[PDB]
Scaffold this active site. Structure first.
Site, PDB file in Angstrom:
ATOM      1  CB  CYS B 113      -0.944   0.035   1.217  1.00  0.00           C
ATOM      2  SG  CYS B 113      -1.881   1.575   1.366  1.00  0.00           S
ATOM      3  NE  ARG B 116       2.602   0.653   3.481  1.00  0.00           N
ATOM      4  CZ  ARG B 116       3.779   0.030   3.539  1.00  0.00           C
ATOM      5  NH1 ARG B 116       4.187  -0.517   4.678  1.00  0.00           N
ATOM      6  NH2 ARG B 116       4.550  -0.041   2.457  1.00  0.00           N
ATOM      7  CD1 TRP B 285      -7.062   9.350  -1.326  1.00  0.00           C
ATOM      8  CD2 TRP B 285      -8.082   9.434   0.675  1.00  0.00           C
ATOM      9  NE1 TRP B 285      -6.166   9.867  -0.419  1.00  0.00           N
ATOM     10  CE2 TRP B 285      -6.768   9.935   0.815  1.00  0.00           C
ATOM     11  CE3 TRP B 285      -8.912   9.381   1.808  1.00  0.00           C
ATOM     12  CZ2 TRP B 285      -6.262  10.375   2.041  1.00  0.00           C
ATOM     13  CZ3 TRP B 285      -8.410   9.834   3.025  1.00  0.00           C
ATOM     14  CH2 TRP B 285      -7.092  10.314   3.128  1.00  0.00           C
TER      15      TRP B 285
HETATM   16  C1  HEM Z   1      -6.367   6.381   2.438  1.00  0.00           C
HETATM   17  C2  HEM Z   1      -5.965   6.365   1.158  1.00  0.00           C
HETATM   18  C3  HEM Z   1      -5.331   5.117   0.484  1.00  0.00           C
HETATM   19  C4  HEM Z   1      -4.639   5.157  -0.651  1.00  0.00           C
HETATM   20  C5  HEM Z   1      -4.331   6.432  -1.467  1.00  0.00           C
HETATM   21  C6  HEM Z   1      -4.205   3.816  -0.979  1.00  0.00           C
HETATM   22  C7  HEM Z   1      -3.459   3.444  -2.077  1.00  0.00           C
HETATM   23  C8  HEM Z   1      -3.331   2.134  -2.470  1.00  0.00           C
HETATM   24  C9  HEM Z   1      -3.056   1.653  -3.811  1.00  0.00           C
HETATM   25  C10 HEM Z   1      -2.871   2.542  -5.047  1.00  0.00           C
HETATM   26  C11 HEM Z   1      -3.002   0.328  -3.758  1.00  0.00           C
HETATM   27  C12 HEM Z   1      -2.783  -0.620  -4.937  1.00  0.00           C
HETATM   28  C13 HEM Z   1      -4.166  -1.216  -5.225  1.00  0.00           C
HETATM   29  C14 HEM Z   1      -4.155  -2.098  -6.453  1.00  0.00           C
HETATM   30  O1  HEM Z   1      -3.300  -1.858  -7.355  1.00  0.00           O
HETATM   31  O2  HEM Z   1      -5.008  -3.039  -6.531  1.00  0.00           O
HETATM   32  C15 HEM Z   1      -3.259  -0.090  -2.385  1.00  0.00           C
HETATM   33  C16 HEM Z   1      -3.256  -1.382  -1.919  1.00  0.00           C
HETATM   34  C17 HEM Z   1      -3.556  -1.798  -0.640  1.00  0.00           C
HETATM   35  N1  HEM Z   1      -3.992  -0.988   0.403  1.00  0.00           N
HETATM   36 FE1  HEM Z   1      -4.004   1.073   0.359  1.00  0.00          FE
HETATM   37  N2  HEM Z   1      -4.663   2.959  -0.001  1.00  0.00           N
HETATM   38  C18 HEM Z   1      -5.385   3.728   0.912  1.00  0.00           C
HETATM   39  C19 HEM Z   1      -6.036   3.269   2.038  1.00  0.00           C
HETATM   40  C20 HEM Z   1      -5.929   2.012   2.582  1.00  0.00           C
HETATM   41  C21 HEM Z   1      -6.563   1.549   3.797  1.00  0.00           C
HETATM   42  C22 HEM Z   1      -7.530   2.427   4.636  1.00  0.00           C
HETATM   43  C23 HEM Z   1      -6.192   0.270   3.989  1.00  0.00           C
HETATM   44  C24 HEM Z   1      -6.541  -0.728   5.116  1.00  0.00           C
HETATM   45  C25 HEM Z   1      -6.996  -0.330   6.319  1.00  0.00           C
HETATM   46  C26 HEM Z   1      -5.306  -0.089   2.903  1.00  0.00           C
HETATM   47  C27 HEM Z   1      -4.685  -1.295   2.739  1.00  0.00           C
HETATM   48  C28 HEM Z   1      -4.229  -1.765   1.543  1.00  0.00           C
HETATM   49  C29 HEM Z   1      -3.916  -3.145   1.274  1.00  0.00           C
HETATM   50  C30 HEM Z   1      -3.992  -4.375   2.199  1.00  0.00           C
HETATM   51  C31 HEM Z   1      -3.457  -3.166  -0.171  1.00  0.00           C
HETATM   52  C32 HEM Z   1      -3.038  -4.438  -0.938  1.00  0.00           C
HETATM   53  C33 HEM Z   1      -4.264  -4.906  -1.705  1.00  0.00           C
HETATM   54  C34 HEM Z   1      -4.053  -6.211  -2.460  1.00  0.00           C
HETATM   55  O3  HEM Z   1      -3.109  -7.001  -2.169  1.00  0.00           O
HETATM   56  O4  HEM Z   1      -4.883  -6.465  -3.368  1.00  0.00           O
HETATM   57  N3  HEM Z   1      -5.169   0.991   2.068  1.00  0.00           N
HETATM   58  N4  HEM Z   1      -3.432   1.043  -1.630  1.00  0.00           N
HETATM   59  C1  W80 Z   2      -5.582  -9.130 -10.600  1.00  0.00           C
HETATM   60  N1  W80 Z   2      -6.129  -7.806 -10.261  1.00  0.00           N
HETATM   61  C2  W80 Z   2      -7.599  -7.906 -10.161  1.00  0.00           C
HETATM   62  C3  W80 Z   2      -8.204  -6.716  -9.442  1.00  0.00           C
HETATM   63  C4  W80 Z   2      -9.128  -5.917 -10.110  1.00  0.00           C
HETATM   64  C5  W80 Z   2      -9.698  -4.819  -9.469  1.00  0.00           C
HETATM   65  C6  W80 Z   2      -9.352  -4.518  -8.153  1.00  0.00           C
HETATM   66  C7  W80 Z   2      -9.989  -3.339  -7.497  1.00  0.00           C
HETATM   67  C8  W80 Z   2     -11.279  -2.966  -7.876  1.00  0.00           C
HETATM   68  N2  W80 Z   2     -11.891  -1.914  -7.315  1.00  0.00           N
HETATM   69  C9  W80 Z   2     -11.268  -1.192  -6.377  1.00  0.00           C
HETATM   70  C10 W80 Z   2      -9.977  -1.513  -5.951  1.00  0.00           C
HETATM   71  C11 W80 Z   2      -9.351  -0.632  -4.885  1.00  0.00           C
HETATM   72  C12 W80 Z   2      -7.946  -0.963  -4.386  1.00  0.00           C
HETATM   73  C13 W80 Z   2      -7.716   0.121  -3.357  1.00  0.00           C
HETATM   74  C14 W80 Z   2      -8.025  -0.083  -2.013  1.00  0.00           C
HETATM   75  C15 W80 Z   2      -7.838   0.949  -1.101  1.00  0.00           C
HETATM   76  C16 W80 Z   2      -8.157   0.737   0.360  1.00  0.00           C
HETATM   77  C17 W80 Z   2      -7.355   2.176  -1.545  1.00  0.00           C
HETATM   78  C18 W80 Z   2      -7.078   2.344  -2.897  1.00  0.00           C
HETATM   79  N3  W80 Z   2      -6.625   3.532  -3.361  1.00  0.00           N
HETATM   80  N4  W80 Z   2      -7.268   1.325  -3.763  1.00  0.00           N
HETATM   81  C19 W80 Z   2      -9.325  -2.604  -6.516  1.00  0.00           C
HETATM   82  C20 W80 Z   2      -8.431  -5.323  -7.477  1.00  0.00           C
HETATM   83  C21 W80 Z   2      -7.861  -6.424  -8.121  1.00  0.00           C
END
Ligand code: HEM
Ligand code: W80
Ligand code: HEM
Ligand code: W80
Ligand code: H4B
Ligand code: H4B
Ligand code: ZN
Lengths: 409, 415
Positions: B113, B116, B285
């Site tokens: 993420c 963070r 967001w």
């Molecule tokens: C507050 C603004 C936040 C921003 C700008 C942000 C940004 C991002 C982005 C760009 C990703 C990549 C997502 C993807 O490519 O699928 C991500 C992944 C992730 N975020 Fe954040 N995030 C935010 C909030 C949070 C919050 C509130 C949590 C948990 C309490 C969180 C936990 C995670 C986790 C666990 C991933 C990995 C997801 C996965 O493995 O599919 N994020 N975040």
């Molecule tokens: C293999 N990839 C498949 C895949 C496709 C779509 C998504 C996805 C769809 N809708 C929304 C998301 C949001 C991921 C995310 C989560 C959080 C907490 C913040 C953020 N900026 N972005 C992710 C994830 C995984």
């Protein structure tokens, strides 16, 4: 175990068996991954098993494992390591070993070409003038008037470590960089230290923005010596844009020949500390990294000006817009001048094809996602979506210390 | 393992020293001989009494350290009370304070993420008293409304009851709370979001009447206490959406694109002190590239580069014209412009990655490190003109953590 790699765009799964053949460490452990670390952390006794393994895989590849030639070679190498604490590669083995070091280079996206490599044997070289001659011939051959050809020139192997052959330049062709009185920097800021080492050795700098550095060559552990590559051997390309006629007025140029000269080639436990090798450019190397890195030529702001872009907020993506135009120009210029170049769409596509080839015939392809994915437009190229396994196979290209840190003058 | 590991930034030459890796608790997938750093994901039973004791103590110790009460009477008492709970009931319950601390730290520890820097500002909704799918729906609706905040998004997590025997799991079947449906046609074409065809077919089977449009918000499919999942429609007024337009190209709005404001992941497992929260939807967001590059331009998703390229009158015969790259930037300008214009929180990839570097540096200074997954942290466009591209990162897994879990339709035993 058999490991699977998936492409998340195509859902193609490949099965890697080849990794079971590694023995050199990656740097990672079960608890810590050092995948984004750029540089992660002989004797007769150590030498023979390594020699043995290499000879075995060579005769395996020409389908004569356990043959008489194979046996005699193994015996031959033994006696030589015994009586000289080293050994010399046959010509066929040198060529095989150099092609497979390229083939095994997990950070290279250009490997679909690996079996087409011109190998120049320079192991009879004894002096810096000799090295200069060999390098001039390499540059001329590889450049080929714009129709670039892959090549490697291999100088004598390490012996005692006090008589190393070294090319001190990190690449054969680079531009100088000068620290200005007012604190700014003329030329390539990344080379300021090396440039000043050249000046301190007697090089008379033109103090321009694109001045080709001299060669600094060390033979047999002696003090290095300076040489100017004859200019007609240095092919350069003026950068212009197909739509923006003001782009030529930026005064940009680059060299056509990418030639790494600071790496160590390892084959069968032998170490070739001087092995300059060259191919042809991928456009982003110049357009993104050389020109737009903050620590390099850093031209984004200037180009953004000429494009009349609003530069107050980052969210206008003004940098991204400038970046794309610069890279269009680079591709256009090289193509217009009939100089070999590949765009990152074509290159990564070729690489996916290469991976498929290697999995089928070889059981895997070591690859470093961090290096293979291009520095722009990552996810609209197919390698972004390709899982890769990274592991170390020998023969290999390795990093080595900078010469100016381990040389007693 | 070495006690100190160095990471370098190759643009600034800044070197940082990591000691936090020593607290690594489980495995990366890598070995001494192979690195699985680019691999996406490298039995219906539960943790035993003996497994739970040290995991609980580890977390409780860490909590009481954080509040400067390590070794206190309150610390030793809590250890004893927790130990008694596991001994008699073979599980235990977290205090509200510990639940909140654990969730914030699972985010703090999430190496993939980039957002963070915000980790300590997380609104935690305790839904451990929930018993039914209708109740889950109420809790999720309140989450969405709170987090959306009329466009001023606020990061939030809602935590449903923990796993017990493994046959009574709470699950949100949706991978994200808000997603668009995808529909496969007889001729092989797809309508809507092609990635979501499978889940959409599941919803339709469960009774959902599909509008069969390009941007149809999917219903929630909610599983309480291991029962069969139930369908609920999120009230449309709770789903904030943004029509995509371009500040220069007046024809861009004619593409009929829109996207939802709230990114909310709902298929992950939250692990705190050995306890497993299989339903823990969390939301933040968007970073613009998530929408502009991935959702819109992935070949397997909405795949709009070609259509935008045509409207931009671009030479599309040679790839070396970089027509794809040129369209990509314009699409991402459109997304940031449309969100800002409607006052819905969004961050561009330059701002986010700069904040992340500052965050990382602060973490190295106060915590002794910051686990980060370079492959995920670096944005999907313009990588090297963001500062994270040049930053060496160490990846390791700390607990509390968010983990992947099997899809519930693969594991569910139908009643
Ligand atoms: C507050 C603004 C936040 C921003 C700008 C942000 C940004 C991002 C982005 C760009 C990703 C990549 C997502 C993807 O490519 O699928 C991500 C992944 C992730 N975020 Fe954040 N995030 C935010 C909030 C949070 C919050 C509130 C949590 C948990 C309490 C969180 C936990 C995670 C986790 C666990 C991933 C990995 C997801 C996965 O493995 O599919 N994020 N975040
Ligand atoms: C293999 N990839 C498949 C895949 C496709 C779509 C998504 C996805 C769809 N809708 C929304 C998301 C949001 C991921 C995310 C989560 C959080 C907490 C913040 C953020 N900026 N972005 C992710 C994830 C995984
Ligand atoms: C022929 C066309 C070639 C293309 C298009 C190509 C492409 C590339 C690119 C883009 C890189 C990244 C460079 C960087 O970011 O610094 C790279 C790295 C590398 N290439 Fe290739 N390459 C080619 C030929 C070769 C040859 C002929 C060899 C050796 C015989 C080779 C061996 C390597 C190695 C060892 C690296 C890693 C360099 C490092 O770690 O610093 N390449 N290649
Ligand atoms: C931290 N980065 C420092 C750095 C800066 C510049 C270079 C560099 C300078 N000039 C040329 C190169 C060529 C890399 C290369 C080699 C080969 C064989 C093919 C190719 N396309 N590209 C690389 C390497 C390293
Ligand atoms: C194969 C590769 O690991 C995969 O495509 C990853 C690359 N990096 C990513 N980074 C983010 N933020 N999100 C992703 O889905 C991916 N996908
Ligand atoms: C920190 C990171 O490993 C470093 O910036 C890498 C990232 N990927 C790269 N990829 C290529 N091709 N060349 C590079 O110099 C780098 N630099
Ligand atoms: Zn690794």
């Amino acid at each position: 175990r058999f490991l699977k790699v998936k492409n998340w765009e195509t859902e193609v799964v490949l099965t890697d068996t080849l990794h079971l053949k590694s023995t050199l460490e990656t740097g990672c452990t079960e608890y810590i991954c050092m995948g984004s670390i750029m540089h992660p952390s002989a004797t007769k006794d150590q030498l023979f098993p390594l020699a043995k393994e290499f000879i075995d895989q060579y005769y395996s590849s020409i389908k004569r494992f356990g043959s008489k030639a194979h046996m005699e070679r193994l015996e031959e190498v033994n006696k030589e390591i015994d009586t000289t604490s080293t050994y010399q590669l046959k010509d066929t083995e040198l060529i095989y070993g150099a092609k497979h070091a390229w083939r095994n280079a997990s950070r290279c996206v250009g490997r679909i070409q690996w079996s087409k490599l011109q190998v120049f044997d320079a192991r009879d070289c004894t002096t810096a003038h000799g090295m200069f001659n060999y390098i001039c011939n390499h540059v001329k051959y590889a450049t080929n008037k714009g129709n670039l050809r892959s090549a490697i020139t291999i100088f004598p192997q390490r012996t005692d470590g006090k008589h190393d052959f070294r090319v001190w330049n990190s690449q054969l062709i680079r531009y100088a960089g000068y620290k200005q009185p007012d604190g700014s920097t003329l030329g390539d800021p990344a080379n300021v230290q090396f440039t000043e080492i050249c000046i301190q050795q007697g090089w008379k700098p033109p103090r321009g923005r694109f001045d080709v550095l001299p060669l600094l060559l060390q033979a047999n552990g002696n003090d290095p010596e300076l040489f100017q590559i004859p200019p007609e051997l240095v092919l350069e390309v003026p950068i212009r844009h197909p739509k923006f006629e003001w782009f030529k007025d930026l005064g940009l140029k680059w060299y056509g020949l990418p030639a790494v000269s600071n790496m160590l080639l390892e084959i069968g436990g032998l170490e070739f500390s001087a092995c300059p090798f060259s191919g042809w450019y991928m456009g982003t190397e110049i357009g993104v990294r050389d020109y737009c890195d903050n620590s390099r030529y850093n031209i984004l702001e200037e180009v953004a000006k000429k494009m009349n872009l609003d530069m107050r907020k980052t969210s206008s993506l003004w940098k991204d817009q400038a970046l794309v135009e610069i890279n269009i120009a680079v591709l256009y210029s090289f193509q217009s001048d009939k100089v070999t170049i590949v765009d990152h769409h074509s290159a990564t596509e070729s690489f996916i094809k290469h991976m498929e080839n290697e999995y089928r015939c070889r059981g895997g392809c070591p690859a470093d996602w961090v290096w293979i994915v291009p520095p722009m437009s990552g996810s609209i190229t197919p390698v972004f979506h390709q899982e890769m396994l990274n592991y170390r196979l020998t023969p290999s290209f390795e990093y080595q210390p900078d010469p100016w840190n381990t040389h007693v003058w």
